[PDB]
Write a protein that binds this ligand. Structure first.
Ligand SMILES: OC[C@H]1O[C@@H](O)[C@H](O)[C@@H](O)[C@H]1O
Ligand SMILES: OC[C@H]1O[C@@H](O)[C@H](O)[C@@H](O)[C@H]1O
Ligand SMILES: OC[C@H]1O[C@@H](O)[C@H](O)[C@@H](O)[C@H]1O
Ligand SMILES: OC[C@H]1O[C@@H](O)[C@H](O)[C@@H](O)[C@H]1O
Ligand code: NA
Ligand code: NA
Ligand code: NA
Ligand code: NA
Lengths: 989, 989
């Protein structure tokens, strides 16, 4: 019969399996002297909820615009009130039935008027560097075409459509399209024209495309240069000038430069070049380097390299997918400042401006195509576009555009087909296309472990153990003997490892030792550089980051998008401070006798001439000595023993026994670089003269007994509970055993393997670890010394409904000045619950004091937190921080702020100071309780209550990376056990 | 050394394994002419948080009372502001380490001054009928003793301690003691002196104990009477008078009464008797009945009986464990009014006054000892007191006191050792003790399935299938051949079945048919009679019930305590209305031709003389005919065919085809009974002349097309969505498919068996059933009739991230007056998620109307809700209720209120009325959405939004009893399938 539905045609276009239509051939992004006009600025924007109600009212013509309001472009429009951001990880936010699209599909109509001078005639084009996800483009009312591939560039010919003077550009953007099925990255869904829009003139006798080939003969030191130039796809005559190298050559001819300085992330040497035809000149930066796979090793310029990498998404906490250039420059500088040398453009090509910065600052780049079909996995990959022939042209297009845009950049050392897209015919087609087009760069793809269509073997989150087996070449064989032979000849990369969500990542050091030991291991890229937090405010206007669910999403994945080394505003997390140290390119081992240090240059190409080597001896009262020592340049992968000045060793010999002192040797920048100023720290090592264990105070002065209180020097006990009620005028509200901490994001993740896959957080809750109860068994005084008396308080700790417990005995002693506390812990019964062994977070004490703390000082590791499998970046020394600065501003509050390896601590409580000494303990000080910390979903929920929560831990569990990847390694697990530890306390007024 | 802890002695007493000390021998509760004074009234009360701080300040003497305030006694003191109620099911609220007690142990000091006249001298006693959990008792400063067994009676001799005139009674009650380990019932923890306190004189030549033996010879009709009387444990001479039977006999001699009328729950004949010694007379009610197990059947007075039972806890929503006498009488009347004939005193003996009411109203009683160790189960029963020899005397005591108190009551037909206490030596000792003491009553205990120490085979929540196998005697054998032979000779009882939590219970009819078919099946007792809800109010003072967690509990079990047939205030839930019908003691099957009905007397002893048999024919406009028919008494377990007056059949023959009419036959009380008034309904049956399927309207008048709307008679469609936007001026805000409902408590329970034990609620959430999305595929008009046109709207329904869907096509038609809606549903793809088949809650439509509804009327089943496996109590007829009265006030809001079997419906929306007809559909009407219903944890969270949510379901799932016991039976499950159904709509103004 009849057909009455609306918008069927717009929707049928959105449901297209094809690439964009009407676009010029894909080419490089080129700096050209051709006239250009940026259309970035204030556009007009109208939002309709779906195609069926998007007006077809000739709005493209620019006149009589009702419903339109101002909107900046580039933009991610949900970041400007229009709709809301939405976060899913794997799950699609719409029903999975490709190529169909939901009825709720935000449609954004963009319109801008601009002036086209005569220099854009006769020929010109319009360039869009990114539209998420489907663009339709009209100029002065005529349709130029459509765009597909949200992070890829499209160029449309406007010759004979651009009119001199006023022009009107109209763009209809659909959030969802068939392309959404192939853009399922773990990140926010954010439609918009989110990258540059540019009018460019195309002069006659110009240059459309250039393909730089710049190799390096590491034996002769020769460069191998060929620069290809074309117009309309055909090779053209052009001249290539490289002044610094005294070169003038024809485009299209290979020459041998007698001697070039080769490009690497370490020494990113770049030669300025120009490719000139009659009507247009293109300016290039040329880095001479050759990539090769040899002996199951990934080599640049003849050397195996070590990738110290991160996964870099593009995200801004207020602008969405638009990352301003000053943020890009700052964050790339920040990466270099933390010894990073490699970037994976997870999981799509970056802004085109990124590539020149990577060339200049020096990163080995894995440039990744915009392709991810992860949400088909949950259905056994049924309908996976990667293996559906109908999607072949769309996916080859995506790969073509990815390669063509960035093929001229030395920093790109690998092409990646995409991410988490399964296996399939279209991936093979993308590989063959890339391999034919650009043999000079190995192909990467992790989704197909057989590695049939790639040149490197890539995995995500392989455990340290499996990595060690791969490093030795003894991983299990593939069933296919041919494929196994190929894959065993491949070097191995962790495209994602040590997931950096919340407190953590743990186990980074164990990976690094393998990277150093085994040449086949190329290194690894941390998942991920940044947290995708989005700024939002509450009533009082206090700012904080939002995550999945905080924007009304029907389906989401919560804080899983906040999984980074820096926050959305690029403030480092402790994991980055640790990472910087783990990947430091020099190793400095200070001799115990302070006569010198062993120095190993862990770089691949550079020597140590860029570094100044500094030493300082610090003591309780500050610096005793310091200076700089001169070090003959150490070659890459070599080592030497540097003598320290004799005054240092002599100072060590003169220290009275038990006086703590720390010798630190640092390698800093001898001069300003392009990524940091002179004096910036790159590497360091220490040797510590530990303080002698604190003398327990003689048990002098007998305990005083009263009706309800007991008194032992400065300590007052409740005779009912047997617990201290004040120490030296400091009110104590509670003292008890701790075995639990507020779960980290890692603790909320499933630990696969074994019959028990409950997250540790759930194991703890089931076991009652968060709700310990204490029963008093007895209190007794015993002869001490010369009248004095110790006080022993015996308790048992358990939880409601459990038969297992620990016996905890506190023996107190005092000489009137310092208080001696010995704690003994003994397992009672079998610590099994729900059929599995219970594990502990800690063995420690919680002191709850009835006064606030202004300042915390300690001798130990710092300044930032450290847990058994983290804190590589925490060095030995003396530290002091205001209470608030002891905390860590994770988006979801969780256990954090512990300072492991403390020998002494001092809390300033108003006018008094509480001092704690003893054998190594971890230190934590909070203005709120653990229950307040666990309950909080965002930082504003953390309310101070005027108390001080002081945690002193004899033992801590590790933090691992169980949110995604390995849990805590065996050596850092904490099974129930017996324990004993001494402390001394003292209050100064 | 020294020992400084406080309260060690009080705590060591609380940790005692022994029974109470200093108490008189256990005896019956006896109505005596001895002087008595109740000390119930306003006592003084002081609360301390534990033994170590409970003052030892001579408070027992009554002078200088600081910290004391007024408190009524009996009381559960947390119900009066002192502390808070706390609910755990299985889990103990304290660490499990018997006999030890937590430091947080509320200690309640009770004190009262009273006057003792001379009639309490020389000898007297003090009687406590219940103290939870540990009592210490002083009178005028001297310690009488202690109490253990919280629901058991203790009596202390006060001779020479009671002083003439003023006396001061002091009682220190500890909430927790070693006894708590054996009182772990699924209920609130509520300390207090919660039952009577009584001063009783003990005259010389009195009677301390009496033991009535009153058997019945069902062959001769003789009574067998022996009344034992004792003083100080020794048999004494007394005279027994039974006037009605012309008997005067000696105590201690067995006589044969020539003819007695025997006692049963159906005919609770009681003979008044007095047992008199010189100094005291005891008044008794004697019911002659004999209990016997024969041929694997439980028989009373020579007949197998059917138990129609409930589990009766003692709970009051504002007074806790104190249940006022008028509530006890009312609720027992209410039970009889719903055909219940049996009570299990779950899981402790009731108030002593209960036993006379049960004798008088008529219930077969399972009287259960106060014993439950359920919380040791989770540890493999390690340390279970039931098998720990140190607990033998305490547990034998409990059983002794239980039996001695109530052994004289005919209503007690079984003794139960306790509940969920595992297996063990002490249970065997309790059984042997009871068996020696009172052979006249079989022993019940469910915890030991081997049944070694019991006389009946008892289970909880055995499935209908397993019950059928037990009923046939073909359940699997025990390993022990001797024990198997014993158990197979036992009749079988479900001490708990068809858990009545929230919407439900389902599957009651399938159990009942087995009880009727198989003599070995004794029947069953529903878990439980009442919800243990506790009254609380919010800001505006609106009252509602609280459950676990609503009182600050650290560990609890939420609404699992609200699992009853009536609410805390004894308002019936729909499950009780269904239960009443399922267990109705007469079966009335009305003949299709309306000539008569088959009547089966399902009683065990009584005939049908107590019933008046009434008929009524009702039609659309009300009653057409009615009257009473006389029925010659039908013997128990017999049946007959009763003719109806010829006018009834003739009326059926005269009905024009399609005119609905309902013949109902009811058996009501011919005269007032002791539990209801004359006319009270006991049983009923119906025969319905169904209305003819509604004629679909001729598809006349063609559909009108506009830019954004389509019009088809009274219906206006949105051309974008293709859905109605108004019908006859009634705004329609949404129309779509439903497959999901707000989970019931049953849906939140694990369905054991199979690899999938996710609750159904979780299966639905994982599957996206609660978040369906609809895509429009096409809208088309088609030739109807004489110009007219149908309108077909094709849609697909799925959910985000899922590949499965349903195709839903709506074909609309109208003649200008009525609207015809045909809906077609077709499965698209395989409905599997997380590896398991998805099940649906329903196949229906949700109409969301933009106006409120005042009234709902329908022809179908009613007046209360009905689901496929419930609604036995809903009868056919015409019903009309205000919107609010369509809802069901479950404590936790959940799916409820559906009216299955509807043929027509009418919603009054202000001035207009919306009418729905069609083949059988279920009807639900709410002022709030399903998401609001699912989110709500208490009724105050249900906010009306001014809309009407109308649900019309072609198919519904059952509700089952999966919260505890069987899920939905196979025949009521709802697997994805294709479906089609027609409806007609019409708006009257
Ligand atoms: O012009 C349409 C097509 O032209 C091809 O030559 C080119 O490889 C593609 O980039 C595509 O855009
Ligand atoms: O390419 C084959 C691989 O595919 C992955 O998706 C899978 O998780 C691996 O176990 C491996 O089989
Ligand atoms: O008087 C103490 C004991 O006396 C026994 O004769 C009696 O069986 C028990 O009830 C117990 O109370
Ligand atoms: O008495 C033996 C029984 O004990 C129960 O606790 C158990 O759940 C049953 O499976 C049965 O073994
Ligand atoms: Na992914
Ligand atoms: Na938290
Ligand atoms: Na229980
Ligand atoms: Na709910």
């Amino acid at each position: 019969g009849r057909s009455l539905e609306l918008g069927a045609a717009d929707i049928q276009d959105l449901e297209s399996f094809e690439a964009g239509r009407g676009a010029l051939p894909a080419r490089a992004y080129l700096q050209s002297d051709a006239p250009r006009l940026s259309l970035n600025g204030e556009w007009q924007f109208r939002l309709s909820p779906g195609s069926r109600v998007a007006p077809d009212d000739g709005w493209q013509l620019g006149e009589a615009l009702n419903g339109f309001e101002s909107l900046p472009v580039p933009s991610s429009w949900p970041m400007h009130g229009h709709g809301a951001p939405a976060y899913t990880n794997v799950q699609f936010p719409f029903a999975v039935e490709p190529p169909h699209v939901p009825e709720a599909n935000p449609i954004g109509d963009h319109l801008v008027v601009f002036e086209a001078g005569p220099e854009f005639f006769p020929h010109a084009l319009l360039r869009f560097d990114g539209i998420e996800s489907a663009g339709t483009v009209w100029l002065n009312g005529v349709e130029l075409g459509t765009t597909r591939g949200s992070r890829l560039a499209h160029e449309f010919d406007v010759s004979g459509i651009l009119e001199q003077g006023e022009n009107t550009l109209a763009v209809r953007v659909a959030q969802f399209s068939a392309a959404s099925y192939v853009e399922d990255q773990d990140m926010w869904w954010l439609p918009g024209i989110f990258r540059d829009v540019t009018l460019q003139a195309r002069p006659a006798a110009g240059i459309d495309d250039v393909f730089v080939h710049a190799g390096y003969d590491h034996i002769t030191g020769e460069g191998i240069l060929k620069v290809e130039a074309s117009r309309g796809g055909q090779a053209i005559d052009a001249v290539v000038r490289v002044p610094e190298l005294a070169l003038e050559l024809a485009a299209g001819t290979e020459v041998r430069v007698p001697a070039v300085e080769p490009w690497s992330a370490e020494v990113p040497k770049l030669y300025e070049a120009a490719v000139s035809a009659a009507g247009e000149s293109v300016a290039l930066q040329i880095g001479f380097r050759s990539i090769a796979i040899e002996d199951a090793q990934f080599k640049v310029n003849g050397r195996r390299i070590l990738l110290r990498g991160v996964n870099r998404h593009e995200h801004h906490p207020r602008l969405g997918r638009v990352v301003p250039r000053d943020v890009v420059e700052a964050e790339l500088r920040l990466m270099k400042q933390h010894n990073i040398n490699a970037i994976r453009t997870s999981h799509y090509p970056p802004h085109p401006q990124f590539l020149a910065l990577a060339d200049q600052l020096g990163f080995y780049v894995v440039l990744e195509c915009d392709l991810e079909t992860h949400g088909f996995e949950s259905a056994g990959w049924a309908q996976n576009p990667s293996d559906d022939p109908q999607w072949e042209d769309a996916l080859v297009d995506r790969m073509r555009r990815t390669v063509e845009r960035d093929k001229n950049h030395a920093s790109v050392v690998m092409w990646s087909l995409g991410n988490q897209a399964g296996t399939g015919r279209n991936l093979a087609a993308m590989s063959r296309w890339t391999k034919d087009r650009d043999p000079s760069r190995p192909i990467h793809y992790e989704g197909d472990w057989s590695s049939e269509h790639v040149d490197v073997y890539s995995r995500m989150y392989a455990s340290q153990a499996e990595t060690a087996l791969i490093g030795q070449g003894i991983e299990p064989a593939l069933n296919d003997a041919a494929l196994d032979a190929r894959r065993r000849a491949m070097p191995f990369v962790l495209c994602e490892y040590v997931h950096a969500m919340g407190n953590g990542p743990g186990g980074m050091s164990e990976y690094q030792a393998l990277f150093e030991k085994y040449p086949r291991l190329m290194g690894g890229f941390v998942w991920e550089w940044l947290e995708h937090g989005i700024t939002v405010s509450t009533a009082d206007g206090v700012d904080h980051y939002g995550y999945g669910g905080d924007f009304g999403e029907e389906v989401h994945d919560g804080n899983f998008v906040t999984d980074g080394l820096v926050d959305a505003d690029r403030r480092p997390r402790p994991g980055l401070l640790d990472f910087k140290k783990v990947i430091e390119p020099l190793r400095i081992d200070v001799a115990r006798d302070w006569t010198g240090f062993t120095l190993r240059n862990g770089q691949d190409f550079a020597d140590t001439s860029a570094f100044s080597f500094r030493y300082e001896v610090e003591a309780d009262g500050g610096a005793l000595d310091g200076g700089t020592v001169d070090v003959a340049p150490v070659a890459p992968q070599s080592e030497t023993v540097v003598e320290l000045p004799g005054s240092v060793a002599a100072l060590a010999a003169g220290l009275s026994d038990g006086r703590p002192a720390v010798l630190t040797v640092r390698a800093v920048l001898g001069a300003d670089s392009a990524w940091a100023d002179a004096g910036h720290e790159v590497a360091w090592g220490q040797s510590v003269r530990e303080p002698g264990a604190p003398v327990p105070p003689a048990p002098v002065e007998p305990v005083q007994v009263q009706d309800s209180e007991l008194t032992l020097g400065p300590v007052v006990f409740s005779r009912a509970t047997g617990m201290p009620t004040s120490i030296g005028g400091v009110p104590v509200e509670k003292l008890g055993l701790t075995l639990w901490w507020a779960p980290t994001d890692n603790d909320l993740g499933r630990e696969w393997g074994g019959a028990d896959e409950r997250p540790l957080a759930t194991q703890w809750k089931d076991a009652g670890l968060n709700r310990l109860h204490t029963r008093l068994l007895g209190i007794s005084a015993n002869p001490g010394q010369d009248g004095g008396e110790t006080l022993t308080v015996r308790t048992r700790v358990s939880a409601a409904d459990k038969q297992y417990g620990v016996l905890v005995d506190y023996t107190w002693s005092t000489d009137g000045e310092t208080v001696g506390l010995r704690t003994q812990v003994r397992r009672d019964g079998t610590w099994v619950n729900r059929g599995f062994e219970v594990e502990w977070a800690r063995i420690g004490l919680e002191f709850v004091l009835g006064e606030e703390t202004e300042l915390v000082s300690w001798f130990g590791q710092g300044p930032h937190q450290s847990y058994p499998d983290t804190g590589q970046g925490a060095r030995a020394g003396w530290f002091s921080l205001p209470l608030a600065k002891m905390d860590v501003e994770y988006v979801r509050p969780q256990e954090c702020g512990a300072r492991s390896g403390s020998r002494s601590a001092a809390l300033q409580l108003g006018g008094r100071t509480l001092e704690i000494c003893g054998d190594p303990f971890a230190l934590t000080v909070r203005p709120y309780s653990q229950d307040v910390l666990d309950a909080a979903a965002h930082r504003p929920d953390l309310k101070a209550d005027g108390r001080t929560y002081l945690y002193v831990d004899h033992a801590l569990r590790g933090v691992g990376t169980a949110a995604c990847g390995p849990g805590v390694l065996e050596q850092y697990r904490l099974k129930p056990r017996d324990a004993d530890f001494i402390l001394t306390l003292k209050v100064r007024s």
